[PDB]
Write a protein that binds this ligand. Structure first.
Ligand SMILES: N#C/C(=C\c1cc(O)c(O)c([N+](=O)[O-])c1)C(=O)N1CCCOC1
Ligand SMILES: [Zn+2]
Length: 421
């Protein structure tokens, strides 16, 4: 067989206490009814404006649309990488307008939980501030019964799930997660539950916590790593706000901006034109530049633009920044070209001084592979199905013709010829 526990079982309560003490629950009772109304209104305003999109993930080789539609709200400049997609924050007021009100709400929500979390983390150890320093929240929506047949929980016969077993990933080590469940209206199939199991462990029965409108749970400390969770579906739909501490070293605007400036230190920077000349060709510096070229291209631009007309429906925040990274990136094409022009140069011990080859070739093949991968996903069959406001753009894109660009989108030729050298 395969078993699980609910409050309907007696074992449940001691199971919770002895094998899940880091999982905390605070029921709707324990939360301001002022706040309850406000965040439930905020979900609705957001939903009504169509801010919550399914994501076209590319998990484990295959393109998939997520049943759950979502939006990330949080710090200005912050990102959160979830199944190879990098979601960008619609921002909240850390120190069109209905939307800005909801973002506010969720900050308030954020700050409240942050308190609750600090509290419980103290009561627990009985470090902290940072591990509850929630920088973002990922909101979710699912149903009404729009899934024609839904997946069965395979191990404990918990029935139908919205989200299969996983870990919430790309978070600060030993960091917490807080979750406000808004249901609107064995385990009761009509009610939404969060499910829990110990990782690897399929025969300790799992736990299935009913979630009613306004209930809140908390994954403290290493719980999220030691255990897996899933979401079991109800009969009605549900919203949730899941506040996290994303590890955003390498995942903020200011970070990526600096990286660009670091790369453009190797260019003579008197004037913005197409005579791109460089201060050195010590391969190490050229490594670094071409890596950064990749980093901004694929981790920010292609990834941003795959989400298409999505953010502009929520906010214009990223427009200037994303235009600027494009300009920054365009110049980095300039440098690639320049680096090419210097290898195929009459002088230069074209022997020995082809370490400017083993410094860059990886970076450039990777540029080619990834470029195919992102082109593919943008005009694959599933990407057409998507709405005209949503469908992925493959940006930045230019034809072998297009003059302004000093290099081709590639296909390969270059990289072939550089193998040959
Ligand atoms: N679980 C989750 C949720 C997101 C999520 C985050 C990840 O890092 C991740 O890897 C996956 N994932 O692999 O399906 C999902 C979620 O939004 N929830 C589940 C609980 C209550 O509220 C909604
Ligand atoms: Zn999760």
């Amino acid at each position: 067989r395969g078993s699980h526990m609910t409050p309907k079982d007696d074992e449940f309560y001691q199971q919770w206490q002895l094998k899940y003490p880091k999982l905390i629950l605070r029921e709707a009772s324990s939360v301001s009814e002022e706040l309850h109304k406000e965040v439930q209104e905020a979900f609705l305003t957001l939903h009504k404006h169509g801010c919550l999109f399914r994501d076209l993930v590319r998990i484990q080789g295959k393109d998939l649309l997520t049943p759950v539609s979502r939006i990330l709200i949080g710090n200005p400049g912050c990102t959160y990488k979830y199944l190879n997609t990098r979601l960008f924050t619609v921002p909240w007021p850390v120190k069109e307008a209905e939307i800005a009100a909801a973002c506010e709400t969720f900050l308030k929500l954020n700050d409240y939980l942050q308190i609750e979390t600090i509290q419980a983390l103290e009561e627990l150890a009985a470090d902290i501030k940072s591990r509850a320093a929630y920088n973002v929240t990922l909101l979710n929506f699912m149903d009404p019964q729009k899934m024609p047949y839904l997946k069965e929980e395979p191990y404990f016969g918990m029935g139908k799930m919205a989200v299969s077993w996983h870990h919430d990933e790309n978070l600060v080590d030993r960091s917490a997660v807080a979750v406000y469940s808004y249901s609107c209206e064995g385990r009761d199939p009509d009610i939404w539950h969060v499910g829990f199991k110990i990782s690897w462990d399929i025969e300790t029965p799992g736990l299935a916590i009913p979630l009613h409108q306004g209930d809140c749970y908390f994954m403290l400390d290493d719980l999220n790593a030691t255990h897996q969770h899933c979401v079991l579906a109800g009969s009605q739909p549900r919203f949730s706000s899941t506040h996290r501490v994303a590890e955003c070293s390498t995942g903020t605007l200011d970070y990526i901006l600096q990286r660009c400036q670091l790369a453009l230190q190797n260019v003579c920077d008197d004037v913005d034109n197409d005579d791109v000349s460089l201060k050195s060709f010590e391969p190490a510096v050229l490594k670094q530049g071409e890596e950064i070229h990749n980093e901004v291209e694929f981790e920010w631009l292609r990834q941003f633009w795959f989400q298409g007309n999505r953010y502009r429906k929520c906010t214009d925040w990223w427009c200037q920044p994303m235009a600027q990274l494009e300009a920054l990136w365009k110049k980095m094409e300039g440098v690639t070209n320049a680096v090419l022009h210097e290898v195929k140069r009459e002088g230069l011990p074209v022997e020995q001084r082809n370490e400017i080859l083993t410094a860059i070739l990886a970076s450039l093949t990777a540029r080619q592979n990834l470029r195919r991968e992102w082109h593919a996903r943008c005009q694959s069959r599933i990407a057409r199905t998507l709405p005209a406001d949503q469908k992925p753009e493959c940006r930045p894109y230019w034809e072998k013709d297009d003059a302004s660009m000093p290099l081709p989108f590639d296909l390969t030729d270059i990289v072939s010829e550089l193998r040959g050298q």
